[model samples]
Target chain A: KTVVVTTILESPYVMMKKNHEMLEGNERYEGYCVDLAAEIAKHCGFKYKLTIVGDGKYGARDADTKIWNGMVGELVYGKADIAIAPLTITLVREEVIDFSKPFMSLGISIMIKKGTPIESAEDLSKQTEIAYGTLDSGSTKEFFRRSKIAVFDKMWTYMRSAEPSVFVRTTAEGVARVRKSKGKYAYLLESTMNEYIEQRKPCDTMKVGGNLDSKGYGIATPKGSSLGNAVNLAVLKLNEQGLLDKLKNKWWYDKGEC
Target chain B: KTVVVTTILESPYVMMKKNHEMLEGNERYEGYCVDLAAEIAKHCGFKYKLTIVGDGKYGARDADTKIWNGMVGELVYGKADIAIAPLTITLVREEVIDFSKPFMSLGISIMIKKGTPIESAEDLSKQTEIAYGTLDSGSTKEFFRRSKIAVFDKMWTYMRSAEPSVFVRTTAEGVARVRKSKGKYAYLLESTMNEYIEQRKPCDTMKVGGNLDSKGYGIATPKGSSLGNAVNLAVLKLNEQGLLDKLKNKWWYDKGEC
Candidate 1:
């Protein structure tokens, strides 16, 4: 019996290996989560199969139908046995799934063209010279929309009504716009992804300002999964062994260019 | 029915009011956790009686008898219906108790005499000019004691055998040492408490370095308690409403001097 692991093909977390079409099974992919899944499996003593999520989303609940989607939906619907991806450990998600101790810490961050004058969200909110936005229908945008804080609420208002639509459909698209917009656009994304892009080749962007919030990414399993307990302990053990930090440095910085 | 809340009397999170001899029951205490308890109880529609933990400990397990102690012990042994103190949401604690979504974020932080030249954990680990320590038998100490990270492990080796025994019995003792040590001692405490002290009277100490880790303080309940679900949702709702951030500022910064 193999554990069916659901993950997304996010760069630095999961990406197609070179010459992937000629490859089969797990050999087709490689990245941080790929490495992590192997470590967790070895520790937990499980044979697992990795499958990409159909929707290419982290997961969200659509209030209209009360339907879940992305890697979370896979677990909720029993389409997968575990999700070893960058899924956030959130109050909503925790109610529906079992999350291991967070293996990575992050929060919403800003990505700007190098040399942009912005220093913080307050700076972005107070000025209109550079347009800024978040991934459409994502956590960052959700935070802005639901926030009661003056600066964030003000930012949400500007983003929702911006001419030509400030939102991007994907992180890659946002990064692309920031690179080509000649300092006219700033993209809001997770600190993890923002930093990864900052160190990638081209390296024309920088993550500015402290992250607007704090949260963590966890390994997720279906609610009441028998594997949950073992997986949770494995993460803690790995962290204490300093393996988690080493893995982070391996992928985030060791392979960095520019 | 009144919920029994077990808490430790710590400065900022919980403190005895001046002239407390004239007060009765919960009226004798005032601080951040005190205020948070009220808000949570009102939202959860429950009356509560706050009681101090007998041992004034955060909680730890005695491997021999397998008995837990601290505010955590109160919950484990059914002495308290809930814990509304600044209890850390740790991997060990979460297994024995149900934690609400974090109401506040914090991590191990460094506190130093204002003019001391220290900016990160690496700086402290490398030098012997300034003596440093953490609260005895606490999570901060646990991190260093169990760490495999080269720098932290090195520091731990130095601390465990340091002359005069750098460990403090309590946070107050640590702060007192820093204030009077004349830049000869630095204390490691949670970022929340460190910042709170940095803003208090005399204000001769500053919180230096990025926090060594990221975690949060959460409201806790006995495992499988009926109140767990409602309390968890209440915290998320309060945070989304920005009440948590407001409370933090009111308690940590609004009352600050120097």
Candidate 2:
């Protein structure tokens, strides 16, 4: 059966072919997340059709618009059966959907414009001298909100009360704000994104804080789906075979993260 | 401040004095389990009192009597804050108590008289003539009854409805039944116990089946207690430091089976 797979274009995870404007979905899909999805599908005895959510948002109940999009929406609204993107597992997401065993473990961290003089999340926790915000509708934002650790709890209080708008609605937006605001605004995101940015020539951003906690990105399926069990077994098999690590190397490590 | 710790006198985990006339709740106790408790208490700056439950059956609700005892009861009824024993973390127990990240991982396995033909849980699952049962009021029993897997589901159905009675009431009872029933009966238990028995010089019993799934023994704590977070973190710290593995080697590997 042609299993429909969902993904998002994140460098090293999912990225476009250089001349991809003329290509179709499967032809255009060419990154680590794509490879992982294809390999897992092959192992699980299924063919796949890759599709990207039209929007860049990570999926959230739009407090203003009341609609969902991106990976979260895909699974919530039955647009896709499995999402193999870099979608992080979070408590808020778990309440509405289910995720298979984590494919890659990671932690939330901060990306600051170079020479920001801030060395840690503790720095942000202590002062309003530097304004910071998390990726809108993503695990990074949720982590700060749900955190109980003293530093993060204090940061959460500031973010919750900050006036004149202290959040971005997308990762791209957050990065852009960090670049333009220069040393005054910081972006909270997964370490992967921060690492990738640091390697680029502009090299204007640097990951400034130690990781906050352990979490992982997962293959998300709608709640109560039969595929969850078989998919979990497939992940264990891939993990045992070292295929997951091989894929990660091909996409992230080989791509040169500076 | 006296931090009260709960424990049991089980072989390998703990051993009873040959003559127990002088022992009291405050008396000296020593074992791999007790040693672990002491190390954790010392590292975390807590002075502790060791106390054995008034009734010692390793925490099972008596079907006929409908009462809980041992570490399980102490945690459930609020008589204790933390339990440091080789307590198997089962789904049934989880419903009543919280366990730290497992200090030791285990799996359900079967032991049989030599010359018996079973080779795995799959083998045990596919047939019934071999008369197999788990330790009553234990993790294996809970696994069979609560598992969502089809083979275990089928086996549990057979066990719960057997004509007269289905199994032994304790590890000792199960071991005795295996010894006396010859090759006609099998006792299901943690692989830890099964491996210990298989190594004895006059061993008539050998573990005959592969484990059904990954399971563990955890340090249990009362649900929502203030010490729960600290206890959980302490276990993870011990795991990282290899202290847990070292202790297992000292008691189980060097000393042999109970």
Per-model root-mean-square deviation over C-alphas: 2.7, 13.9
Instruction: Count clashing residue pairs in model 1.
Output: 0
Segments in model 2 whose C-alpha atoms lie over 4 Å from true places: A62-69, B1-258
Cα lDDT of all candidates, in order?
A: 0.87, 0.75
Docking class of 2: incorrect
The A-chain TM-scores of all the candidates are 0.96, 0.90
Question: Cα deviation in Å at residue B77, candidate 1?
Answer: 1.8
- lDDT by residue (B1-258, candidate 2, tens digit) is 788888876656766655556777534566688789888897778988888767665687877887786789988888887898878865457667876656676667888988888787677777867788876666567667765667778888877887556677667678888888767778788888777667665678888656666545778888767786677667655654447767877877686543
- Tell me which residue pairs clash in candidate 2: none
CAPRI tier of model 1: acceptable
* Highest-TM-score candidate: 1
**lDDT of model number 1:** 0.87
